[PDB]
């Protein structure tokens, strides 16, 4: 299994992004999938996630601006980023526990990082 | 089933 | 993107050793680069990187004994190794997170690995 | 170096097939060596590689139904491909990581492909 | 500017 | 000396 994230870019503050996070391969269930930040020369940290709950649960700087959401047929999430701002800026990170079809054992999965960027 | 992020 | 390595060789232990990691292609901005190695049988594990912060981690392995510096012009990044054991032995891998100039999506580049033995 | 890739075509589900590949050129160590296949439309997949200490990996598809061995004096390896299914249909890629007698660089080497086709 | 590993 | 896949 493998995760390419797209969207993300540049803008200014008051500005949108949409990310794709699509994910190859076998999948029979999610543990965890979401996006972490991380600020340069800090600690990564969670963003948004959803457990399999079902119960997403958002980091505080997240108000509405962040709005999580999946495409299950086609193994793609998207976090639509809405009113951007400088002080939030990071490394974005695609993030996945899953199970594929022929194993009971979990993985970890990141993606390679998206720049955003204000 | 229901929609693999919860059968 | 291409990356290639240079340096490495055979030293008796105590000895010393430089390695390089040359970047060809356009670069926006740098979010990690630097070395792993893998000694035959084992699992690759990372010997010095620099992140985005610009803060530069060492194995616990290290203790000192190597020294991670760069040239961004050149798109160089070098590791000076001294006080090389027999245990150092093994295949270091440049290693690239990397901005490509225009795309927004990070993506990792490896060198095709450089040859180190230290013995007598 | 060179590699020339022989065997691969088309059978059944059930069948067999067998792939062998050929190095030209002088070759000190073997860092990796083994295939890759790419079905059309997808990725590329690593398949079944040796590493330095021996150990021979096999991807998860493998089920034990493909089995790798070598020669090191033809300087060949052989991929024996049993118990096929239409899902393995892909192009088949040799490959190395070798140092160049020469230096203490490891180059990449692919050879060109071979067709393994199952169907009906 | 310091040098892009970052101004 | 083993066999250049490694000696």
């Known amino acids: 299994v493998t995760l390419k994230e797209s969207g993300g870019g540049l803008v200014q503050p008051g500005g949108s992004l949409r990310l794709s996070c699509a994910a190859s391969g076998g999948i029979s269930r999610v543990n965890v999938a979401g996006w972490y930040r991380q600020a340069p020369g800090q600690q990564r940290e969670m963003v948004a996630v959803?457990?399999?709950?079902?119960?997403?649960n958002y980091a505080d700087f997240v108000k509405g601006r962040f709005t999580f959401s999946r495409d299950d047929a086609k193994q793609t999430i998207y976090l639509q980023m809405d009113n951007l701002k400088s002080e939030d800026t990071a490394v974005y990170y695609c993030?996945?526990?899953?199970?594929?079809?022929?194993?009971?054992?979990?993985?970890?999965?990141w993606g390679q990082g998206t720049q955003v960027t204000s | 089933x229901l929609x693999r992020x919860x059968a | 993107v291409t990356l290639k390595e240079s340096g490495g060789g055979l030293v008796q232990p105590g000895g010393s050793l430089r390695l390089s990691c040359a970047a060809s292609g356009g670069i926006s901005r740098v979010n990690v680069a630097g070395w792993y190695r893998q000694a035959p049988g084992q699992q690759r594990e990372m010997?010095?990187?620099?992140?985005?912060?610009?803060?530069?981690?060492?194995?616990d392995f290290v203790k000192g004994r190597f020294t991670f510096s760069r040239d961004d012009a050149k798109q160089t990044i070098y590791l000076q190794m001294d006080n090389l054991k027999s245990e150092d032995t093994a295949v270091?891998?440049?290693?690239?997170?990397?901005?490509?100039?225009?795309?927004?999506?990070?993506?990792?580049?490896?060198?095709?690995g450089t040859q180190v033995t230290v013995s007598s | 170096v060179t590699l020339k890739e022989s065997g691969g075509g088309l059978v059944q589900p059930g069948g067999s097939l067998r792939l062998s590949c050929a190095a030209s050129g002088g070759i000190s160590r073997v860092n990796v060596a083994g295939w890759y296949r790419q079905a059309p439309g997808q990725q590329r997949e690593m398949?079944?590689?040796?590493?330095?200490?021996?150990?021979?990996?096999?991807?998860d598809f493998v089920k034990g139904r493909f089995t790798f061995s070598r020669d090191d004096a033809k300087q060949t390896i052989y991929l024996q491909m049993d118990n096929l299914k239409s899902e393995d249909t892909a192009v088949?890629?040799?490959?190395?990581?070798?140092?160049?007698?020469?230096?203490?660089?490891?180059?990449?080497?692919?050879?060109?492909g071979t067709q393994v086709t199952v169907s009906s | 500017x310091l040098x892009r590993x970052x101004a | 000396x083993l066999x250049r896949x490694x000696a």
């Open positions: 959803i457990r399999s709950g079902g119960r997403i």
């Open positions: 993030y996945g526990s899953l199970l594929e079809t022929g194993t009971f054992q979990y993985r970890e999965y």
